[PDB]
Design an enzyme around this catalytic site. Structure first.
Site, PDB file in Angstrom:
ATOM      1  CG  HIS A   1      -3.309   3.355  -5.932  1.00 31.34           C
ATOM      2  ND1 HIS A   1      -3.782   2.387  -7.055  1.00 31.34           N
ATOM      3  CD2 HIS A   1      -3.430   2.444  -4.755  1.00 31.34           C
ATOM      4  CE1 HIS A   1      -4.059   1.476  -6.512  1.00 31.34           C
ATOM      5  NE2 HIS A   1      -3.981   1.531  -5.117  1.00 31.34           N
TER       6      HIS A   1
ATOM      7  CE  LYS B   1      -2.934  -0.637  -1.395  1.00 31.79           C
ATOM      8  NZ  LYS B   1      -3.845   0.430  -2.539  1.00 31.79           N
TER       9      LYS B   1
HETATM   10  N1  NAI Z   1     -11.493  -0.931  -3.385  1.00 29.52           N
HETATM   11  C1  NAI Z   1     -10.707  -1.842  -3.671  1.00 29.52           C
HETATM   12  O1  NAI Z   1     -10.065  -2.458  -2.528  1.00 29.52           O
HETATM   13  C2  NAI Z   1     -10.001  -2.327  -4.856  1.00 29.52           C
HETATM   14  C3  NAI Z   1     -10.316  -1.542  -5.997  1.00 29.52           C
HETATM   15  N2  NAI Z   1     -10.035  -2.062  -7.379  1.00 29.52           N
HETATM   16  C4  NAI Z   1     -10.346  -1.288  -8.685  1.00 29.52           C
HETATM   17  O2  NAI Z   1     -11.145  -1.904  -9.702  1.00 29.52           O
HETATM   18  C5  NAI Z   1     -10.655  -1.261 -10.748  1.00 29.52           C
HETATM   19  C6  NAI Z   1     -11.222  -2.483 -11.569  1.00 29.52           C
HETATM   20  O3  NAI Z   1     -10.397  -3.411 -11.238  1.00 29.52           O
HETATM   21  P1  NAI Z   1     -10.380  -4.786 -12.101  1.00 29.52           P
HETATM   22  O4  NAI Z   1     -11.753  -5.525 -11.818  1.00 29.52           O
HETATM   23  O5  NAI Z   1      -9.182  -5.543 -11.795  1.00 29.52           O
HETATM   24  O6  NAI Z   1     -10.199  -4.406 -13.673  1.00 29.52           O
HETATM   25  P2  NAI Z   1     -10.679  -5.468 -14.878  1.00 29.52           P
HETATM   26  O7  NAI Z   1      -9.813  -4.823 -16.089  1.00 29.52           O
HETATM   27  O8  NAI Z   1     -10.516  -6.731 -14.563  1.00 29.52           O
HETATM   28  O9  NAI Z   1     -12.238  -5.131 -15.156  1.00 29.52           O
HETATM   29  C7  NAI Z   1     -12.794  -3.646 -15.445  1.00 29.52           C
HETATM   30  C8  NAI Z   1     -13.983  -3.749 -16.111  1.00 29.52           C
HETATM   31  O10 NAI Z   1     -14.609  -2.479 -16.471  1.00 29.52           O
HETATM   32  C9  NAI Z   1     -15.190  -2.544 -17.607  1.00 29.52           C
HETATM   33  N3  NAI Z   1     -15.085  -1.078 -18.101  1.00 29.52           N
HETATM   34  C10 NAI Z   1     -14.016  -0.018 -18.433  1.00 29.52           C
HETATM   35  N4  NAI Z   1     -14.787   1.160 -18.713  1.00 29.52           N
HETATM   36  C11 NAI Z   1     -16.026   0.724 -18.604  1.00 29.52           C
HETATM   37  C12 NAI Z   1     -17.078   1.798 -18.775  1.00 29.52           C
HETATM   38  N5  NAI Z   1     -16.976   3.078 -19.029  1.00 29.52           N
HETATM   39  N6  NAI Z   1     -18.274   1.356 -18.552  1.00 29.52           N
HETATM   40  C13 NAI Z   1     -18.606   0.188 -18.790  1.00 29.52           C
HETATM   41  N7  NAI Z   1     -17.518  -0.831 -18.278  1.00 29.52           N
HETATM   42  C14 NAI Z   1     -16.262  -0.229 -18.096  1.00 29.52           C
HETATM   43  C15 NAI Z   1     -13.987  -3.267 -18.478  1.00 29.52           C
HETATM   44  O11 NAI Z   1     -14.467  -3.742 -19.993  1.00 29.52           O
HETATM   45  C16 NAI Z   1     -13.979  -4.477 -17.504  1.00 29.52           C
HETATM   46  O12 NAI Z   1     -14.609  -5.445 -18.116  1.00 29.52           O
HETATM   47  C17 NAI Z   1      -9.370  -0.970 -10.676  1.00 29.52           C
HETATM   48  O13 NAI Z   1      -9.094   0.425 -11.351  1.00 29.52           O
HETATM   49  C18 NAI Z   1      -8.618  -1.054  -9.327  1.00 29.52           C
HETATM   50  O14 NAI Z   1      -8.092   0.001  -8.730  1.00 29.52           O
HETATM   51  C19 NAI Z   1      -9.561  -3.228  -7.341  1.00 29.52           C
HETATM   52  C20 NAI Z   1      -9.034  -4.007  -6.079  1.00 29.52           C
HETATM   53  C21 NAI Z   1      -9.323  -3.641  -4.890  1.00 29.52           C
HETATM   54  N1  SHR Z   2      -8.873   2.703  -8.736  1.00 30.67           N
HETATM   55  C1  SHR Z   2      -8.004   3.674  -7.758  1.00 30.67           C
HETATM   56  C2  SHR Z   2      -7.694   2.688  -6.734  1.00 30.67           C
HETATM   57  C3  SHR Z   2      -8.472   1.858  -5.960  1.00 30.67           C
HETATM   58  C4  SHR Z   2      -7.910   1.168  -4.780  1.00 30.67           C
HETATM   59  C5  SHR Z   2      -6.989  -0.045  -5.187  1.00 30.67           C
HETATM   60  N2  SHR Z   2      -6.466  -0.714  -4.026  1.00 30.67           N
HETATM   61  C6  SHR Z   2      -6.162  -2.162  -4.371  1.00 30.67           C
HETATM   62  C7  SHR Z   2      -5.550  -2.486  -5.587  1.00 30.67           C
HETATM   63  C8  SHR Z   2      -5.550  -4.193  -5.885  1.00 30.67           C
HETATM   64  C9  SHR Z   2      -5.238  -4.347  -7.402  1.00 30.67           C
HETATM   65  O1  SHR Z   2      -5.419  -3.633  -8.305  1.00 30.67           O
HETATM   66  O2  SHR Z   2      -4.890  -5.542  -7.611  1.00 30.67           O
HETATM   67  C10 SHR Z   2      -6.046  -3.070  -3.148  1.00 30.67           C
HETATM   68  O3  SHR Z   2      -6.296  -4.269  -3.254  1.00 30.67           O
HETATM   69  O4  SHR Z   2      -5.404  -2.537  -2.145  1.00 30.67           O
HETATM   70  C11 SHR Z   2      -6.858   4.053  -8.765  1.00 30.67           C
HETATM   71  O5  SHR Z   2      -6.490   3.867  -9.690  1.00 30.67           O
HETATM   72  O6  SHR Z   2      -6.120   4.995  -8.109  1.00 30.67           O
END
Ligand code: NAI
Ligand code: SHR
Length: 367
Positions: free
Chosen positions: A94, A75
């Site tokens: 990030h 982190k």
């Molecule tokens: N809050 C937390 O603890 C976490 C947050 N995240 C965040 O989630 C985001 C996505 O992560 P993943 O699921 O691994 O990405 P991913 O790339 O597997 O899936 C993203 C999906 O969004 C779709 N997409 C993109 N733009 C779009 C739009 N304008 N409208 C509709 N669909 C759209 C894509 O086609 C894709 O299927 C990342 O930016 C990441 O930082 C990920 C892990 C943890």
């Molecule tokens: N979408 C935001 C960050 C969301 C928080 C992500 N934290 C996750 C990241 C894990 C991953 O992307 O595999 C976490 O698990 O701590 C940005 O783009 O700044």
């Protein structure tokens, strides 16, 4: 040889580790020297790392370690650390999507002549991420969202969804959510409709998986991805959903999915927004209805509406730490092949790509 140094996480409530004891044991057999900081927040016991062969050192000893050690952590660094970063660092920073403060993150590396290899941008030859927590985030996100929705059916509006703590396993999380959920249905609440945008990705998948496990019917879940949103926002299907879960990867500037105007409406059914993507500090955040980043100890924020029922946002930015031990094992296993290439990081494309990406972002920084 390569020397790695696992940094103790300082982000509050962060219980995951970037290398697990298994991962450390495998790297040692490959000839790495591995130091592990004794971490008070880690879900892993320090003795698992001892038995793995790690050299155990104190929390925050990375700061004074020899310059050849690669410092690995998950982190962000504390905002209050202002000294130059001189090592090679592997972490999530990030700071490549113009998040608020991104220049300050990079400026520490620039002043120290350090290198950032950002975990999110480690990719295979085919442009795909080598290791990702998304599934666990969509899963944990969906669980808290269903819990929030259910709470709003059986509790005073005066009350907010209480502090959450990490679970020892998925079964226990699903059991809590299913109890709250059945309890709300038992009292006459209509089965929620859940709108997922980014449904085909990693976190979208984890969220669908949770919703199934808890007993929400497929018909009740609207699975949206790029097709469904090409028309451009704001959308009507968000205020009319019970639960909205944002699982997109925000890469291009886009029209916001909803706004305050559409939400101030007596006939709004929407009770809970789970912002899994969590691009809260991004200037193109397609969910400009909140500004607080919620935390496990206070997982929801009220969206102040002028018509319609109480609506709350969840915006925890490290959801996978709800299930810290298996999330960590999952991620470290998928990361391991890349880490084995660190002796060759000067030529290995996975590492080189990430170094060149860092240098191009540092070039954008005002001096
Ligand atoms: N809050 C937390 O603890 C976490 C947050 N995240 C965040 O989630 C985001 C996505 O992560 P993943 O699921 O691994 O990405 P991913 O790339 O597997 O899936 C993203 C999906 O969004 C779709 N997409 C993109 N733009 C779009 C739009 N304008 N409208 C509709 N669909 C759209 C894509 O086609 C894709 O299927 C990342 O930016 C990441 O930082 C990920 C892990 C943890
Ligand atoms: N979408 C935001 C960050 C969301 C928080 C992500 N934290 C996750 C990241 C894990 C991953 O992307 O595999 C976490 O698990 O701590 C940005 O783009 O700044």
């Amino acid at each position: 040889a390569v020397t790695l140094h696992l940094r103790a996480e300082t982000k509050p409530l962060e219980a995951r580790a970037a290398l697990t004891p298994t991962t450390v044991k495998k790297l040692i057999a490959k000839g790495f020297k591995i130091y592990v900081e004794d971490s008070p927040q880690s879900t892993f016991n320090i003795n698992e790392y001892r038995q793995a062969g790690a050299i155990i050192v104190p929390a925050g000893s990375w700061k004074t370690a020899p310059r050849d050690r690669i410092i690995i952590g998950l982190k962000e660094m504390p905002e209050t650390d202002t000294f130059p970063l001189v090592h090679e660092h592997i972490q999530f920073a990030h700071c490549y999507k113009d998040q608020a403060g991104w220049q300050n993150v990079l400026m520490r590396f620039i002043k120290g002549h350090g290198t950032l290899y950002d975990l999110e941008f480690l990719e295979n030859d085919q442009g795909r991420r080598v290791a990702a927590f998304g599934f666990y985030a969509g899963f944990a996100g969906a669980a808290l969202g269903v819990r929030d929705w259910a709470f709003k059916q059986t509790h005073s509006d005066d009350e907010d969804l209480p502090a959450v703590s990490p679970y020892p396993n998925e079964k226990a999380l699903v059991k809590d959510v299913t109890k709250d959920y059945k309890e709300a249905l038992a009292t006459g609440a209509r089965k929620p409709t859940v709108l997922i945008i980014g449904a085909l990705g990693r976190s979208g998948s984890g969220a669908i998986d949770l919703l199934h496990k808890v007993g929400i019917p497929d018909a009740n879940i609207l699975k949206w991805d790029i097709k469904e949103t090409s028309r451009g926002g704001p959308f009507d299907e968000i205020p009319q959903a019970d639960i909205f879960i944002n699982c997109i990867y925000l890469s291009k500037p886009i029209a916001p999915f909803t706004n305050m105007e559409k939400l101030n409406n007596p006939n709004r059914r929407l009770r809970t927004v789970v912002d899994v993507s969590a691009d809260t500090t991004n200037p193109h955040n397609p969910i400009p209805i909140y500004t607080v980043a919620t935390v496990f100890n206070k997982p929801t924020v009220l969206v102040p509406t002028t018509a319609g029922p109480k609506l709350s946002v969840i915006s925890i930015d490290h959801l996978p730490s709800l299930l810290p031990r298996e999330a960590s094992e999952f991620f470290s296993h998928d990361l391991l092949p890349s880490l084995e290439l660190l002796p060759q990081r000067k030529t290995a494309p996975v590492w080189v790509r990430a170094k060149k990406l860092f240098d191009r972002h540092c070039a954008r920084v005002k001096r």
